[PDB]
Every structure is written in structure tokens, then in C-alpha cells.
Amino acid sequence: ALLSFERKYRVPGGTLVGGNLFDFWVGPFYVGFFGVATFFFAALGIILIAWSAVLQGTWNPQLISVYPPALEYGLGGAPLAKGGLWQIITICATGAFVSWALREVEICRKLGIGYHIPFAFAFAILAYLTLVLFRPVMMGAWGYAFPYGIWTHLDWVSNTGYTYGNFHYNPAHMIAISFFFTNALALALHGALVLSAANPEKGKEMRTPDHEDTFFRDLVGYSIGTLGIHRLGLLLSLSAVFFSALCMIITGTIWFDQWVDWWQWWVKLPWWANIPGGING
Amino acid sequence: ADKSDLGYTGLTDEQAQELHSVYMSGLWLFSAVAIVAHLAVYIWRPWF
């Protein structure tokens, strides 16, 4: 199936060196060179919810668990359901993260829409990596990792997330939250910055980008335009992750101690050194 | 070139060729089986 204007856009290529051997449009979906790759990755991956459903216990993805290896086995493998079989799921996950963000280029080079999209999933490629590769290779073994589940890695983040006291004292974490609540801060007015002009209240003539400049300059004193808030969505939604992968690339591997004990490096200053002031005083 | 006004199709006489080939007979015997493969199953296994 294809759209009405999807007539002129149909042209073979996009893929690199080898030919148009893999680029057949199966339905509404694109099966380029990384299309059948993800077909190979998505077919094996549904079984990885069902494998440790006979080794760890339950058959329902409520408590299904293929645990990460232990902490100290070294630079190597593991048991199985408790690491070994866990060690196989990732290169599919990530091998499928990759075969997706780069099958887009077989459409990007196919037409001529920009290459800033093999990229906004690469802050998701550099956000799931920081929990599977970036951490547990150095402190001992692959045992420093989370479980894949949907209720297993839940009681892994809270009642097992106060190893560093409270994680709010974690400054970049809290800056990578000074970056996150600001994502829907600028989707809430921009997802409503194109809605109510052809549908004003009912009947009225449509607005142009000069009413935008009498509504938002009549809002919050800053009107960078309409191309300043798509440079104000891709500024809300990619970086709360490098300020979290930096809230953790120096947390646990260097600071497996209380980050509530980090906020006593601030009160130590020669000026007010030997001085208890307020609350502290 | 595509087509004209509402609806086409349509259309008279083009409403009964493909909305009636696997959309009418592919549902009536599906309903017959909802009667046939159900009435023989209207007795087992409610009664022990």
C-alpha cells in the first residue's frame, strides 16, 4: 500500500555498495538493507522474553528476568539466565537500535531530507549504552547492570536506588532534570502553536506568523520565531541524557558512596570555613 | 487522471462487484458457522 502522492517518490537505490538487492517495500514499511536486518533482530528478540521464562521462573513479562552477570567473574561470561543468556540479548537490542537509525539513511540518501535523524536516536544509542557497556567493564565484571523487565528493573531503581543517599544531590542528574521538565515545557505551547487559527473558535479567518508575534510576545517576553522552538524541541529531548550519562559515568564507578555526602564540598571554603551558620549552625 | 465527484466508487452500477465478492459471502457462511459450529457446541461441556 502507498499514498496518493507516493507516486513520484518511488525510486531504487539509497543503499550503498552492492546494488538494490535489499530495498523491497513490504507494505507501509521500509525493508532496505537494514530492513531485513531488523527483521532478523525483531524475530529473535520476542523469544528473549520467553527464554528465562523457564529458567528464572514465570512466563509472564511481569516478572520475567534474564539477570546481568555477577560483579567479579571478570572480563568474560557468566552463568546463563543470570548473565550468559543476558549477554546475548544486548547485541540484538543494540544490533537492532543500529539497524534502524541507519536504515533511515537508505531513505535519506534515497530522497534528500536531512541527516539530523540518524542522530536523535543516537542520544538514545548513547543513553541505553551507558547502562550496558559504559559501566560494568571496569569496576569488576558485567554485574553492574539493570534487568530488562518491566517490573523487575522497577524494584531495582528505588528501594535499590539509595546507594548514593539521595540522587537529587546529584547535580548533573538534577541539571539533566533542569533539562527534562523543560521538554514538555516547550511541547505544550508548540504542540499548541499550530492548532487554533483555522480552528480559532469557529469561522474566523486564519492567523499568520504576525499573530504568533502578538500572542507569544504577548506571553513570556521571548519570541525566537517558529524555527526557534524546533530549536526548542530538539533542545529538551536529547540532552537530559548526556547530563544523566554524565550523572553516572562518575557515579558508582568513582562514587559508589553517598551523593548526599557531596553537598559538604560546598560548605568548605576558607572564608566561611570554621563557621556554622544556619540550619548547619 | 483519477475520478470525479462523490463518490466513484460509488457508483451505480459499481457498488456490487468488490464490496460483495469477499464481504458478503465471506461473512454469511462465517455466520452460518456461528450457527453451525455453535449449535453442536451448545451442549458440551455445560452438562457434566
Binding site: 499514498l3 513520484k8 517495500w25 | 487522471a1
Partner: protein, 250 residues
């Protein structure tokens, strides 16, 4: 209320919100049409809605949307696979019939209007707002195409007000017959420009803007689409292009 109540006014009132939302994103584009002009396979589980009335910003008519969807504009792809699926290929050269990577559309002859009573995009010789009167000022320098050779000379800027922005970079030919080219692809460093899209002997194939000051919304389709035409094919196959089109960083 209770411990088991409120999660049900939700598994229902919102279990059809991917349903109600999808159709509202499936206005334009749909219905689905085949590879010729034909009531196609179908639409989907979220079929297209029958549109509501659309009032336009500068009295451009009763253009309901989804609107015109048929085969008005010329298309030229020689159907390789008559079966629906396998792609199609242009007749002669793909940058003359306008098929593949270079796209456009035929619209009405009324350009984009703002609210002052005037058009949207004008050159610097159509708005004496900001000028040149201090030091030495760069609005007039030579360029280079993707063939790695000089292409022309750009000496002007199409100004903007509401966005205070820019949209085109006008090229003074040897003659004067107008040409155009987009804005974001560009990659200028020092004293000469480099574009990596079109070769320097395929710039005249870019339509002369009917007016050197006006861009009608009809014209603003190929004019920012021919460069996309050269982002797919270019360029088979051997030597310099391999050290030009591939690699790079930005």
C-alpha cells in the same frame, strides 16, 4: 473513591485515543492511491475522516483539507514493475522529467501573504531596511558547485522580518536569467563558498523565478527540491566523486 474503579474510565476513554488521534493525523495524504491513479488497497484501521471547513489566512477560498489529491501535475516514471511494490525509473535523465529525488507541485497563483498587505520573501533590493555603510562588507562573493568548480556569484540577500531570517541566496549569472537555491545545505568557511549538492554545470536547469522579487507558492516546490534531486543519484560511479560525496562529517 475506591481501590478499583478509576483505571476503567481510562482503559476505555483512552483505549481509543491512538484511534481518534491517528485519523486526525491521517487527514492529508489519504486516501491511499495506487501507482497510477487508482482507489488503492485501502486506508487502514484508522481510516481518513471527512474533512471540516477550513478558513484561509488571506481569503484563498474554500480549500478543504484533505483537498486536491488527484493527478494534476506531470509525473514521468517508466513503470518497471507493473506489480505494486518494485520501484520505477524515469525516462531519459531523471533531472528533466522531474521524478525520484526532485519533487514539486502545482498550486494556485497567489503567493504566501502575511498581514501587512504585502508578500513574504523579498531581496535586499526590495527592502531598504538594512544596508552597508561601515568598514568593508561582504555581500558579493564567488561560489563553487559539487563538481568542485566555480558556479557563479552571489551579491544579495532575500530578507525576512517576522522571523528576521533568510531563505534564498540569489546568483548573478553572466546574463541575468533568474535562478534559485536553498539555505540550510550551505557550508561556507572563508572567502569562497562550497555547495556539495549540484555540479556547476547544472544550475541553469533551476527555474528562473518568474519574478526576481516574488516567490509564488507554486514556484516554491522545485526551487527547493532540485538540490534534493542531486542527493540521491549523485554520483555514479568512480574516482573524484567517491572522495567528495562520501566520507565528510557535518
Amino acid at each position: 473513591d475506591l481501590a478499583s474503579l478509576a483505571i476503567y474510565s481510562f482503559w476505555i476513554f483512552l483505549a481509543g485515543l491512538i484511534y481518534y488521534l491517528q485519523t486526525e493525523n491521517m487527514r492529508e495524504g489519504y486516501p491511499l492511491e495506487n501507482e497510477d491513479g487508482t482507489p488503492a488497497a485501502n486506508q487502514g484501521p484508522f481510516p481518513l475522516p471527512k474533512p471540516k471547513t477550513f478558513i484561509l489566512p488571506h481569503g484563498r477560498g474554500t480549500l478543504t483539507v484533505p483537498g486536491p489529491e488527484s493527478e494534476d501535475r506531470p509525473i514521468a516514471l517508466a513503470r518497471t514493475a507493473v506489480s505494486e511494490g518494485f520501484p520505477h525509473a524515469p525516462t531519459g535523465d531523471p533531472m528533466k522529467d522531474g521524478v525520484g529525488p526532485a519533487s514539486w507541485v502545482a498550486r494556485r497563483d497567489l503567493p504566501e501573504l502575511d498581514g501587512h498587505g504585502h508578500n513574504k520573501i523579498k531581496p535586499m533590493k526590495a527592502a531598504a531596511g538594512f544596508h552597508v555603510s561601515a568598514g568593508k562588507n561582504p555581500i558579493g562573493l564567488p561560489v563553487r558547485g559539487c563538481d568542485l568548480e566555480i558556479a557563479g556569484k552571489v551579491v544579495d540577500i532575500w530578507v525576512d522580518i517576522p522571523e528576521q531570517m533568510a531563505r534564498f541566496l540569489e546568483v548573478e549569472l553572466k546574463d541575468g536569467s533568474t535562478r534559485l537555491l536553498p539555505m540550510q545545505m550551505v557550508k561556507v568557511q572563508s572567502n569562497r563558498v562550497h555547495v556539495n549538492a549540484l555540479s556547476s554545470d547544472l544550475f541553469a536547469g533551476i527555474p528562473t523565478i518568474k519574478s526576481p522579487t516574488e516567490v509564488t507558492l507554486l514556484e516554491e516546490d522545485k526551487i527547493c527540491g532540485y538540490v534534493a534531486g542531486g542527493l540521491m543519484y549523485a554520483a555514479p560511479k568512480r574516482k573524484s566523486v567517491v572522495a567528495a560525496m562520501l566520507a565528510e562529517y557535518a
